[PDB]
């Protein structure tokens, strides 16, 4: 019999043993384990997606994306385990190198020095540069998705909400609504809910920077509509120009209804922060996504000048294109694609 963790079977032996619980979601569980073959500690995610089309879609995306990606600040896939025939495949197990902690945990236990904050931010943006150069949007950056070892190496994880958006094509009206985790959610996810861009990831990074500076989330909305109020309580009411940019009439009128709010200066919120950090914070937390700093310009900001080196910041060799996006398909078809995508890890595979 295979090992079992909190009632879930983890059919991953004999290679992977000594499973310990780490966490879960709606259709899976993550455990730590020991790889007896390579003699390394791993994290193993069990996914059981095949009954729901949206779970299948996200599983395929995460797999396709992470199997192409290779970057020091992004967690790689070491192995994928699943059944030898499509009919027996109910679960998929993804294996990664085990990291020691994550930023969410670290921020519960430790006040970070400015030097730590600066280096972590550099690593997040260096990883993001690579992700955005591939035409991928992460869409769920937050502290618990940033893994760390005690050597201060940072890696971005969780591509379960990530997708490709080929910039040759206007995706306005075609992106999934209600992405990101609420506190890290850019205002245009609420106001241009089907037409946002990779700029949402910069917003989330700004939220993360704010959180490193104070060990608390900057915009802790209690519900979807309160989120936008939290944002505007600090940024203040948008300029008329920024309102006049909002293409969606219902959204623009909804903002016109709201009472006026003044800008809270960054240095009253963060009176002990490095001034340059606050400058970069302001640029990342810019209301208008077309005025918000892009990842390359953020890396070039004075705050990160001791680390910025475009000769050592890889970009994707083969950015993903519109081909990698037509996954709006029946769940049974997505299962076939997941089976094909994971075939290279099976005994007897041939291309």
């Amino acid at each position: 019999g295979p090992e079992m963790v909190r009632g879930q079977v983890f059919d991953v032996g004999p290679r992977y043993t000594n499973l310990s619980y780490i966490g879960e979601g709606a259709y899976g569980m993550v455990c730590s384990a020991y790889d007896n073959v390579n003699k390394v500690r791993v994290a193993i995610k069990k996914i059981s997606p095949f009954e729901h089309q949206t779970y299948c879609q996200r599983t395929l995306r995460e797999i396709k994306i992470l199997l192409r990606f290779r970057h020091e600040n992004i967690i790689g896939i070491n192995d994928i385990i699943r059944a030898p025939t499509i009919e027996q495949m109910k679960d998929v197990y993804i294996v990664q190198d085990l990291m020691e902690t994550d930023l969410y945990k670290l921020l519960k236990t430790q006040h970070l020095s400015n030097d730590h904050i600066c280096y972590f931010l550099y690593q997040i943006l260096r990883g993001l540069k690579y992700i955005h150069s591939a035409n991928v949007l992460h869409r769920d950056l937050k502290p618990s998705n940033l893994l760390l070892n005690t050597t201060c190496d940072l890696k971005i994880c969780d591509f379960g909400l990530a997708r490709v958006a080929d910039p040759d094509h206007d995706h306005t009206g075609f992106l999934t609504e209600y992405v990101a985790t609420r506190w890290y959610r850019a205002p245009e996810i609420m106001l241009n809910s089907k037409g946002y861009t990779k700029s949402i990831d910069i917003w989330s990074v700004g939220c993360i920077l704010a959180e490193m500076l104070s060990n608390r989330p900057i915009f802790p909305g209690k519900h979807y509509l309160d989120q936008l109020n939290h944002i505007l309580g600090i940024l203040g009411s948008p300029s008329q120009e920024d309102l006049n940019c909002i293409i969606n009439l219902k959204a623009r009128n909804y903002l016109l209804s709201l009472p006026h709010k003044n800008k809270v200066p960054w240095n009253r919120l963060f009176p002990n922060a490095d001034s340059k950090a606050l400058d970069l914070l302001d640029k990342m937390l810019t209301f208008n996504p077309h005025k918000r700093i892009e990842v390359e310009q953020a890396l070039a900001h004075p705050y990160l000048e001791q680390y910025y080196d475009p000769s050592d910041e890889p970009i994707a060799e083969a950015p993903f294109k519109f081909d990698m996006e037509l996954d709006d398909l029946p769940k049974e078809k997505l299962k076939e694609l997941i089976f094909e995508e994971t075939a290279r890890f099976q005994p007897g595979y041939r291309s």
Binding site: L106, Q110, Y119, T150, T151, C152, D153
Partner: peptide, 14 residues
């Protein structure tokens, strides 16, 4: 318990 930044390989290169 978090080590100095210079224990990171990436930082050593910089």
């Amino acid at each position: 318990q978090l080590k100095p930044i210079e224990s990171s390989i990436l930082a050593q290169r910089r």
